[PDB]
Design a protein around this motif. Structure first.
Motif, mmCIF file in Angstrom:
data_model
loop_
_atom_site.group_PDB
_atom_site.id
_atom_site.type_symbol
_atom_site.label_atom_id
_atom_site.label_comp_id
_atom_site.label_asym_id
_atom_site.label_seq_id
_atom_site.Cartn_x
_atom_site.Cartn_y
_atom_site.Cartn_z
ATOM 1 N N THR A 23 1.090 -0.867 0.193
ATOM 2 C CA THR A 23 0.231 0.470 0.268
ATOM 3 C C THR A 23 0.385 1.065 -0.699
ATOM 4 O O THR A 23 0.239 2.289 0.662
ATOM 5 C CB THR A 23 -0.624 0.411 1.248
ATOM 6 O OG1 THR A 23 -0.234 -0.052 2.304
ATOM 7 C CG2 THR A 23 -1.876 -1.091 1.114
ATOM 8 N N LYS A 25 2.980 4.505 -0.737
ATOM 9 C CA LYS A 25 1.843 5.915 -1.983
ATOM 10 C C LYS A 25 2.456 5.821 -3.549
ATOM 11 O O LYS A 25 1.779 6.052 -4.410
ATOM 12 C CB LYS A 25 2.688 7.134 -1.530
ATOM 13 C CG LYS A 25 1.368 8.160 -2.155
ATOM 14 C CD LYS A 25 2.438 9.662 -1.256
ATOM 15 C CE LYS A 25 2.437 11.348 -1.838
ATOM 16 N NZ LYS A 25 0.145 11.329 -1.151
ATOM 17 N N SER A 26 3.264 5.101 -3.975
ATOM 18 C CA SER A 26 2.861 4.989 -5.580
ATOM 19 C C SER A 26 3.481 3.995 -6.032
ATOM 20 O O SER A 26 3.482 3.850 -7.294
ATOM 21 C CB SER A 26 5.195 4.926 -5.380
ATOM 22 O OG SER A 26 5.419 4.142 -4.782
ATOM 23 N N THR A 28 0.269 1.100 -8.276
ATOM 24 C CA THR A 28 -0.585 1.289 -8.571
ATOM 25 C C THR A 28 -1.637 0.586 -9.687
ATOM 26 O O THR A 28 -2.632 1.036 -9.675
ATOM 27 C CB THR A 28 0.679 1.320 -10.886
ATOM 28 O OG1 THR A 28 0.546 -0.229 -10.840
ATOM 29 C CG2 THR A 28 1.593 2.287 -10.405
ATOM 30 N N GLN A 41 -5.110 2.860 -10.535
ATOM 31 C CA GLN A 41 -5.127 4.148 -11.426
ATOM 32 C C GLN A 41 -5.206 4.083 -12.749
ATOM 33 O O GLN A 41 -5.599 2.786 -12.904
ATOM 34 C CB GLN A 41 -3.017 4.134 -11.580
ATOM 35 C CG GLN A 41 -2.809 4.378 -10.274
ATOM 36 C CD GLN A 41 -1.161 5.549 -9.981
ATOM 37 O OE1 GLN A 41 -0.738 5.175 -11.576
ATOM 38 N NE2 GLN A 41 -0.648 6.088 -8.758
ATOM 39 N N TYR A 144 -12.126 6.695 -14.205
ATOM 40 C CA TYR A 144 -11.894 7.017 -13.048
ATOM 41 C C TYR A 144 -13.122 6.470 -12.404
ATOM 42 O O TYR A 144 -14.248 6.521 -13.054
ATOM 43 C CB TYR A 144 -11.906 8.207 -12.650
ATOM 44 C CG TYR A 144 -9.628 8.337 -12.366
ATOM 45 C CD1 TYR A 144 -9.428 7.826 -11.682
ATOM 46 C CD2 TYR A 144 -9.428 10.024 -13.871
ATOM 47 C CE1 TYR A 144 -7.830 8.325 -12.275
ATOM 48 C CE2 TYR A 144 -8.341 10.131 -13.830
ATOM 49 C CZ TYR A 144 -7.666 9.057 -12.831
ATOM 50 O OH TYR A 144 -6.404 9.591 -13.243
ATOM 51 N N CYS A 180 -8.544 4.816 -9.058
ATOM 52 C CA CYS A 180 -8.401 5.867 -8.710
ATOM 53 C C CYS A 180 -6.955 6.836 -8.683
ATOM 54 O O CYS A 180 -6.081 5.974 -9.422
ATOM 55 C CB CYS A 180 -8.474 6.127 -7.183
ATOM 56 S SG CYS A 180 -7.818 4.848 -5.870
ATOM 57 N N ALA A 181 -6.568 7.988 -7.900
ATOM 58 C CA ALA A 181 -5.709 8.803 -8.251
ATOM 59 C C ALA A 181 -4.365 7.983 -7.396
ATOM 60 O O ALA A 181 -3.418 7.691 -7.530
ATOM 61 C CB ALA A 181 -5.489 9.983 -7.729
ATOM 62 N N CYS A 182 -4.783 7.059 -6.260
ATOM 63 C CA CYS A 182 -3.870 6.771 -5.113
ATOM 64 C C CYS A 182 -4.294 5.609 -4.302
ATOM 65 O O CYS A 182 -4.777 5.273 -3.302
ATOM 66 C CB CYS A 182 -3.573 7.698 -4.063
ATOM 67 S SG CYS A 182 -2.834 9.209 -4.767
ATOM 68 N N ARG A 185 -3.045 4.744 -0.960
ATOM 69 C CA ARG A 185 -3.703 4.986 0.623
ATOM 70 C C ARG A 185 -5.351 4.645 0.445
ATOM 71 O O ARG A 185 -5.942 4.885 1.562
ATOM 72 C CB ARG A 185 -3.606 6.898 -0.164
ATOM 73 C CG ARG A 185 -4.050 7.573 1.468
ATOM 74 C CD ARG A 185 -4.578 8.923 0.766
ATOM 75 N NE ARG A 185 -5.195 9.574 -0.531
ATOM 76 C CZ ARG A 185 -4.702 10.450 -1.737
ATOM 77 N NH1 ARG A 185 -4.812 11.374 -1.210
ATOM 78 N NH2 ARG A 185 -6.492 9.935 -2.270
ATOM 79 N N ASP A 186 -5.900 4.673 -0.622
ATOM 80 C CA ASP A 186 -7.200 4.692 -0.693
ATOM 81 C C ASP A 186 -7.890 3.083 0.126
ATOM 82 O O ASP A 186 -8.419 2.856 0.868
ATOM 83 C CB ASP A 186 -8.281 4.449 -1.903
ATOM 84 C CG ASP A 186 -8.069 6.466 -2.444
ATOM 85 O OD1 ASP A 186 -8.021 7.440 -1.024
ATOM 86 O OD2 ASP A 186 -8.812 6.155 -3.586
#
Ligand SMILES: [Zn+2]
Length: 195
Positions: A23, A25-26, A28, A41, A144, A180-182, A185-186
């Motif tokens: 998990t 932050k980077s 995908t 992503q 998205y 999603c973008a992250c 995090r999600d």
């Protein structure tokens, strides 16, 4: 109508598997077993493993289809939003309307159902390569979850079916998806919310 989402291993013991991507932050693409939910992503590779207890017949195929998870929206066809369906990012094979694509398989076929108007992508079920115990399909999600006029923040499920050469059901599995973008995090947020 609404496609079934009932888990069904069938005669060949069909089920999915996911990598353990963590998990950070980077990341995908990451899968939560506790939520049965894939976080990814936009248009990034989503490796999905196919496991069977015995080899299915030649001509067996594997289909992916998205439906809305909430019963209020299940009858609505999941499609790309008015923006992404027009952004000319076709791989030459996927129709621009389709949310789910298969990466790097020239035998992928894309269906617009003549009756339900639902979209799906289907590939031949291949045996594992020597030294491997499963086969992996690489999927891309091309909108998205938040895209206005499209999924519009509504959660979806991906339904994976194992099919014979006529399209009859051999096996079924499914998972929720958030594009999603992250993802890292999600996933962390939603798993905390659960506990
Ligand atoms: Zn979109």
């Amino acid at each position: 109508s609404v496609p079934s989402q009932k888990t069904y291993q069938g005669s060949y013991g069909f089920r999915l598997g996911f990598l353990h991507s963590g998990t950070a932050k980077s990341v995908t693409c990451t899968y939560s077993p506790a939520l049965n939910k894939l976080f990814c992503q936009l248009a990034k590779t989503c490796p999905v493993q196919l496991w069977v207890d015995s080899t299915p017949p030649p001509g067996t195929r594997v289909r992916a289809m998205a439906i809305y998870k909430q019963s209020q929206h299940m009858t609505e066809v999941v499609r790309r939003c008015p923006h992404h369906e027009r952004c000319s990012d076709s791989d030459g094979l996927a129709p621009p309307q389709h949310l789910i694509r298969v990466e790097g398989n020239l035998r992928a076929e894309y269906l617009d159902d003549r009756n339900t108007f639902r979209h799906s992508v289907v590939v031949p079920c291949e045996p594992p390569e020597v030294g491997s115990d499963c086969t992996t399909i690489h999927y891309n999600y091309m909108c998205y979850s938040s895209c206005m006029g499209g999924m519009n923040r509504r959660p979806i499920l991906t339904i994976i079916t194992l099919e014979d050469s006529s399209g009859n059901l051999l096996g079924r599995d499914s998972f929720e998806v958030r594009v999603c973008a992250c993802p890292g995090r999600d996933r962390r947020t939603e798993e905390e919310n659960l506990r």
